[PDB]
């Protein structure tokens, strides 16, 4: 039967009640728009509505035109603000939160289809849920070399500007998504083992379908370097995207092999960065701080950029400089998911 540590992981990520609660925390109205009736049509219409809001934000047009565009969004994607006036979506940050909400609904839509029982199946439902992921998860020995390198990568690349929590590694799984090896660009140079964080609602989607580029209808300004798959070399930069809290302080972190090839190195946000590649295989947003190559090690022949991070001396002379690197590939065939960390956030 299923390892007890794998059963606990599946039970955790397949919990629809937890998805309901995360959605209610993001102000989505699960009473008016239940997760059972969630569709890709509803989400796509939501993205279309956020595009009009993006246009108002871009132009500095608040007031009544913004209020009308926001009502269309709240009609297409029901929210619960109780007795409060529904707030305007006014800042790029606010727009990003609504893109993240629709990205969460997309992975929950996948989860609701997958976390179904068949009468005829002789399997416990938990077992059926795991089989339906088409993704092997194997628990690793805490005395193993891999666990030691991954513990060090987690701790040594916790950024100094993310001092509101530490992370304790509760457990570690090897990930083997069916088909991901066969698809992967093994040929490409510059293969790095990099971080990705996501909300607890998203892991069924990510493990069963892999990391995916943003929806085509999503507002382009939601994406600092366009519609690719985003990774960090600093554990805490990625772990901030877990959105864990004091009350929900268990999250997951993913390590993937990312075939970066030649990076187009950029100093400032450019949502059209995908077009600027021109023969290059990835975008690298340069940070002020990064692990130094003197501390690099390998795991399964991928480079692990162990910290501590130090000043890169990179500055954007005409803009904000990223504190930390980020890596964007625009094709899932440049990603191979490899490890899944069960992380206790110490707030
Ligand atoms: O601009 C971004 C957006 C998302 C994102 C990063 C950079 S690095 C990372 N790790 N998990 C999620 N992410």
Residue numbers in the entry: 233 to 579
Lines quoted from the article behind this entry:
The human diphtheria toxin-like ARTD family contains PARP and tankyrase (TNKS) enzymes that can catalyze both mono-ADP-ribosylation (MAR, mono-ARTs) as well as generate elongated and branched chains of poly-ADP-ribose (PAR, poly-ARTs). The PARPs and TNKSs form a family of structurally and functionally diverse enzymes, which are involved in the regulation of various key biological and pathological processes such as DNA repair, cell differentiation, gene transcription, and signal transduction pathways. PARPs and TNKSs use nicotinamide adenine dinucleotide, NAD+, to transfer an ADP-ribose (ADPr) unit onto target proteins or nucleic acids with the release of nicotinamide. Here, we report our contribution in identifying a set of compounds based on a new nicotinamide mimicking chemotype,triazolo[3,4-b]benzothiazole (TBT), able to inhibit different PARP family enzymes with submicromolar activity depending on the substitution pattern around the central core. The binding mode of the TBT scaffold was studied through the synthesis of analogues and their complex crystal structures with PARP2, TNKS2, PARP14, and PARP15.
On the contrary, hydroxy derivative 16 (OUL245) inhibits poly-ARTs with a selectivity toward PARP2. Interestingly, the presence of a C-7 hydroxy group made 16 very potent and specific for poly-ARTs with nearly 10-fold selectivity for PARP2 over TNKS2 (IC50 of 44 vs 370 nM). Based on the comparison of complex structures of PARP2 and PARP15, 16 has a similar binding mode as 1, but the catalytic residue of PARP2 (Glu558), not present in PARP15, interacts with the hydroxyl group of 16. The hydroxyl group also interacts with the Met456 backbone amide via a water molecule. In addition, 16 showed μM IC50 values for the other active site glutamate containing mono-ARTs PARP3–4. This is consistent with the crystal structures where the hydroxyl of 16 forms a hydrogen bond with the glutamate. 7-Hydroxy derivative 16 is of special interest as a poly-ART inhibitor since it is both a potent (IC50 = 44 nM) and specific PARP2 inhibitor with 13-fold selectivity over PARP1. Structurally, PARP1 and PARP2 are both able to form the same interactions with the hydroxy moiety, and therefore, there is no apparent reason for the observed selectivity.
